[PDB]
Amino acid sequence: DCTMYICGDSTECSNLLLQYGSFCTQLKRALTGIAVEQDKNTQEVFAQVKQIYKTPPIKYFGGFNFSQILPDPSKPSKRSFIEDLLFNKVTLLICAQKFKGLTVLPPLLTDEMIAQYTSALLAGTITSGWTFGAGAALQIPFAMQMAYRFNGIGVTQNVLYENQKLIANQFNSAIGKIQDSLSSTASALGKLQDVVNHNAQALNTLVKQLSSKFGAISSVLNDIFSRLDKVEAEVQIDRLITGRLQSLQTYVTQQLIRAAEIRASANLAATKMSECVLGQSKRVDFCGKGYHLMSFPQSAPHGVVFLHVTYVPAQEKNFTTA
């Protein structure tokens, strides 16, 4: 809010401020560019499917156990097991800044249907393979779907069938370690923790800035008009208006830099969801170290979490070749 931040609950400060022109009609215009943009990035990552598929009640995918990441009906929200750990690991009287016109708006897509997209992508990538991302969905047995992925890597499909029991147990054990390991180290969520820190810490400096004198007598507007004559009181006030105002245009400039950077990250995430999920990518290390097989998305506060599944060769022996 323009006027209240500069001229707190003052009537003689407001009219003097009007002489400075249309300086802060840009701030309403500039900030709304950021506000509209943030409702677009979320819609460009999760809304790539126009059919809300649902998982069948039976969870027997030839031995594989996906119950770890499927939504849980018992929980009041439709959040999976891993998705619940993320919320507890992210922290969002400090809300007294409302009194200085520093409003905060809510996102268009609230958290509840954000997971609904995630459920749709997870359901449609285990019963229809990847064809559902190119038109009509086609069901394929999951136990035999892995054969196509192994063929793409370079190994013949026979290898999968000989070790179906072995491969399922190894994969099932792998996902179990992810649950505890995520909460083991505190720096895992660092790339998300700083986002809520930066967008909250910067507000504190803006509020704390208006307590400085900026070369005037006092930091409060009321006493100046009640102690000094109107003819020269405009000198001290003008020394203070240009102080707070300049400190405000610094804040908006900082927001533009950060906003221009997040967009460069959301677009990369959009490609990751488009390629590493809806298909198999031949690019190296783009969807995780080692040969790529599949990946699953998971929602998170102000971000997304990917779970890549990769193939890695074990011990070897040396031979002689011609």
């Binding site: 809010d1 209240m4 707190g8 609950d9 409702d39 499917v49 126009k50 059919q51 809300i52 598929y53 649902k54 069948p56 039976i58 027997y60 030839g62 007294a96 409302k98 009194f99 200085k100 016109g101 409003t103 708006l105 809510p106 996102p107 268009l108 897509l109 609230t110 509840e112 249907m113 609904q116 997209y117 449609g124 019963t127 229809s128 559902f132 009509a136 969905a137 086609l138 069901q139 394929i140 047995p141 136990a143 509020v207 704390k208 208006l210 307590s211 930091s219 409060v220 009321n222 006493d223 009640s226």
Partner: protein, 183 residues
Amino acid sequence: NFNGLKGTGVLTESNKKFLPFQQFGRDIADTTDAVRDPQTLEILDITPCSFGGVSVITPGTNTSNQVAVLYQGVNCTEVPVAIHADQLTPTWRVYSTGSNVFQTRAGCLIGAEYVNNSYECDIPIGAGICASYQTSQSIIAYTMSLGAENSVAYSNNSIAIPTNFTISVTTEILPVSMTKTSV
């Protein structure tokens, strides 16, 4: 007006314990929000009056001229209490007693009815609410529609194979440059 400490707000009672010499209490922003009455020694608490933002919902001027204002981030049981003369900065107070008021997460809406059926978004509001102009015409507010729900029959032994195909053409637009300028 407390010994020249001019200001504006609503005064309540607080449990803060001023020491015998203390008279004024400051905050993070270094402004007065706790004063002791000179005559009767009690610890009052000062907070500024209520406020918020205003947004107007409207279709194009070519369509009907009906509107629906919004009050951001305020309990909706407050501004209807302000139904008097010359108490609010907006002067179009005819809509204070408007249509059926509706309460949302981002404030409350005046001039629309919360229908049950859901369509795709037309005018974003917040917290999964988008208004539109449906049919005898009116402004309505409803809930998000994520697309038609569908289920795929999954079985241990079955597969689908296409028996035909189609060819489609899709367009795409990208900016490449902006107007060169100098000053």
